[model samples]
Target: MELIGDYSKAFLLQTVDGKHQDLKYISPETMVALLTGKFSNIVDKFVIVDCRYPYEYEGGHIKTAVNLPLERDAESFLLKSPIAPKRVILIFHCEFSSERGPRMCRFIRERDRAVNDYPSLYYPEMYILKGGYKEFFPQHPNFCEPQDYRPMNHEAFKDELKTFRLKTRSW
Candidate 1:
C-alpha cells in the first residue's frame, strides 16, 4: 500500500516526470481470482495487458490479455480505447516482474497527470502482475493459452509430454 517509489525527496522532485505515481502489485493467485470473479464479461471491468513482444505473446499469454509491446506508448492505446480510462482496471505483465511491466504502468500514470484538463479526466486504476508471466503460467496454467507451443522453444524438455499444454479458455 505504501507508495511504490521513493518519497523522501521534495514532492516536485519525487518522480522523473514531476508526478508522484503509486502502483499496486497483485500476486498470481489474486490475478486468477479476478479472472474468475463476478466480472463475467471481465473485459467490461478491467483490461489485462501483456507487455511483451508479439512473438512472446503468441507463444503464451494470460486469458483475455491483449499484447501491447513495451515500445509503444501506453497512452496511445487508451486514447483509442472504447472503454473510458477511469471506468476500468488496467493490469500489466511481462515475462518477469521486471522492467517492461513497471515501466508501462509508470508511463500511463505520467500521461494521466499531464492531461488534467477536466475533472472527469481520470487515470485508470492500475496494477502490475507480480512475478509476471513466468509465475502466473506455472501457478495457474489453466489461465494460459499458447497459440503455438513450439514457439516456446522448450527444446530441453522436448521429450516431456506436457512441457506446454495449450488449452483455450471457454470464456
Candidate 2:
C-alpha cells in the first residue's frame, strides 16, 4: 500500500509537540470528509485510534474508533503485532492531541523504524487529529459514538483519570 498522507494538506502547528517529531496531521473537517466519503478512495480500510484513557473513550469517541491509551496500550497493540496493511491510515487523538496522542504516534514510528526496513512500515499513513475530540465534538457531534463529548476532566471520571495518569503500565 502506498503512503497517502499529504501533511502539506493540513496546517502545521508548532504548539503540538511530539518526541518523534513531524508526524502528519489532519483537521476535524477533513476527518468528517473522509468518513462521509468525500474522499471515497477507501473509508473501510482506514483506522481511527483514540489514544485517550479507556474511561475517557467510553464516555465518548469517534464512531467505530478503537481505544488504545498511550500510557499502557501503545506498545502492545502497535508493536506486539504488525498491522497488515501498510497504507491503512491511523488517526490518533486524545482530549487535546497535545501530549498522549502525539507521543503515541511517535511510539508507533519508533517501533516501525526498528522492525521494518527503509521505505516500508507496518503503517505509514499516520495522522494526529488536530484539536482532538475537544475540537471535533462541538463542531460535529454527529460523528461521535453517542454524539456527545466526554472530556478527560469530566467530573465523573476525575479520579479515574488521575489514577490512570499516575500509574505505570507495561502490563
Candidate 3:
C-alpha cells in the first residue's frame, strides 16, 4: 500500500519555532522521580516495563516489571500479551540511556511509526529515560532511597506525581 503521510511526525515533536523533542522520550529528572520510589504510588497507574536485553533484565530490574527486550522481532510480542487496552498505562526504561529504551517507547507508544507509512497503532504514553539509568537514579546520598521491600516517607519526599487524569484534564 502507498503511504501519504510523514510517519516520523508521531515519534517526533517540533517546537513552534521548529525544534523537536520527540514525545516518545522522557527526561532524567522525570525518570528519577519514576524509579526512586517517588513514582511508586503512580506505578499502579502504569504497567511498568523494563526494556533491556534479556540478560540485562535478568541481572536486575524494577520490582513487578516484566522483561520485554527491545528487539526488531519483539514487535510481535505485543500481540501475545494480555495488557488491557486503555486500562493500563505503560512505562519503560533501559539499564542505561540506550537504543533499547527508545525502541521500547516506540513499541508501547502507539503513536510511533518508524515505517513512515502506517500510522501508529499503540496506546500508551511511552517515555525514554533522559540520561538512561545512570542519570535516572538518585544522586544525593541522603535521599529517600528505599531499597527492596522498604517504605519510608520524609518531608522532602512527597508524591509529586499528579494523577495522569488530573494532569491531562486540567487547565
Candidate 4:
C-alpha cells in the first residue's frame, strides 16, 4: 500500500471551499441553461431532483424539478433488472446542496455500484446543484414554478417538518 497526500486529494476539490467535498457540483446558471434548452443540442434528457421535504417541495421548486423527498425515492432510479438504459444526467439538490440533496445522490451512486459491473455506472452524469434552489430561486425566479421558496426549518411547517425529518432521519 502506498500513500501520497496530494495524490489522495484527487477526489477532493481546490476550486470549492469545503475540505471534504468529493461529488461533482454545478452552478445554478449552468443548470438553468440545461432546463431552458440552451444545451439541448448536447444533452438529451436531464432531470432535476429536489430532495427537500414535502412542504418545502410543495411550496416551490424549479419548473422542471421532480420531488424525490425520501431516501427510498432516490434509490428507485436504479433498476436492477438487466440494465435499464445506462445513461441520463441527474442533478440533485435540496434547499441548499449542503446536505439532504447530496445525501440522496450518494444513495443512488451507492446502489448503482452494487447493481452493476465494476466500472459501469447506471447514471454516470450525476451532479449536485451548487447552493441549490436557494441560489437558483433568487437569480432566476421564472425558472421556479410558483416563485415562492420556503426553507426546511420554516415556522409554519413545524409539524410536517418534523414528520419528514423523523422519517428520513430514523430510517
Candidate 5:
C-alpha cells in the first residue's frame, strides 16, 4: 500500500550538481499544429485535454479540447468514459503549463503503473503544453473557441488576436 521507490524520479530528468531536472514539454507551435490536423495521419492519434477548472474551460479553450480538471482523477475518467480510446497520445495543458498540467500527466502514468489487475488499462504517451495556454492563445488566437475568455493579467495580447480574420478550416 505504498509507492515503489521514489515517485519523484519520474518527473526528474537528471541532475548534475544537486539541481532539479525538467520533464517533457510540447511547444505552442507543435500543439497548434497537432490540434489543427496539420500532421494528417497523427491528427486522430492524440487527444487534447485542458487541465483547468470548469469556469476557466467554459470561458475559453483550445478548439476541440475537452475539459478535464486537474483536481479530478484523470485516470479513472479516461477509463470510465465510453468514448475514450486506448494507448494513444495525451496532450495536457493548464493556464501556464507549470504545475497542474505536469502533475496530472505523472498522476495518470503512476495510476496506470500501480493498477496491474486491469488488463484493458492503457498507458498513454503524455506531454505537457510548454508555456501553457497563456502563451498559446495569443500566438494562435484562431485556435481558441469563443475567444472572449482571456487569461488573468494578460490583456495586452488582445491587440494581437485578430478574431475577425480568424477562421476555422476543417481537414
Candidate 6:
C-alpha cells in the first residue's frame, strides 16, 4: 500500500473535545468479525486496524486486528502502521468501531484513490457503523447484530458517499 497522508494529516475532531485528533472508526459487523470472526470473509478484503489504546488492544483484541493506537498519535502510528497502499484495503475501529471508521474512510476516499482514478478503476468500497459498537454487540451475543438486515442503512451510507467523493459529485 502507498502512504497517502501521515497520521497527523489524517487526524479528525474528537467527538468529546471538539479538538482535532487522529481517530479511526469501523462498524459492528467489522467489529463482529474482529471480535468473533462471524464475517471473516471480509477480513481479507480489507486491512482491519484496531483503534483502541495499546493497553486496551493488548487486553483482548480480535484476532488479526492490527493494533495501531489511533488516539495516542495518529500519524506516527498509522504512517508507521505498515499500511502501504492497495496492498490490502483498510478498516479502522475503536471498541465499537463506528464514527471514526467512516471518517477514515472518507479521508482515503477523497485523499488517495480519487487522485489515482482510471477508466478501469471502479470506486473503492468504504463502510462505517450505523450505530457503532454500542448498538450492535449487545444485541447478538451469538453472531452479532450484523447477522440481521443491515442493508437498509449500510447500502444507503455506502451508496450515498459516492456522491460525496470529490472525484465524483454528491448525489
TM-score of each: 0.65, 0.78, 0.46, 0.81, 0.65, 0.39
Give the Cα error of residue 32 in candidate 4, in Å: 1.1
> Each candidate's lDDT (Cα)?
0.60, 0.71, 0.43, 0.70, 0.59, 0.41
lDDT of 2 at 38: 67
Off by over 4 Å in 6: 1-44, 69-89, 118-123, 129-171
In model 5, state the lDDT of residue 158.
52
* Root-mean-square deviation of every model: 10.5, 5.1, 14.5, 5.6, 10.9, 14.9
| lDDT for each residue of candidate 3 in 34-147, tens digit (9 for 90 to 100) | 546564653434444666544444434455566665343345555344344312345566665555566556554443354324554343344454544444444422322222
* Residue 66 of model 3, lDDT score: 65
Best by TM-score: 4
Question: What are the per-residue Cα lDDT tens digits for candidate 2 across 1-171?
Answer: 223333223232223343335666677888887788665554335678898888878878998788888544666776677566413667888887567788777777777777766655666667788888998989988889877777887888888988887764543
Best by lDDT: 2
lDDT of 6 at 85: 34
Clash pairs detected, candidate 1: none
Q: Judge candidate 1 against the unseen true structure and give its global Cα lDDT, from 0 to 1.
A: 0.60
lDDT tens digits, residue span 19-41, model 5: 11344566777786676667655
Error of 4 at 19 (Å): 6.6
The residue pairs in collision within model 2 are: none
Q: What is the TM-score (0 to 1) of candidate 6?
A: 0.39
Clash count (model 2, backbone only)? 0
Off by over 4 Å in 5: 1-22, 70-73, 81-87, 117-121, 152-171
lDDT of 6 by residue, 20-41 (tens): 2332334454455544545455
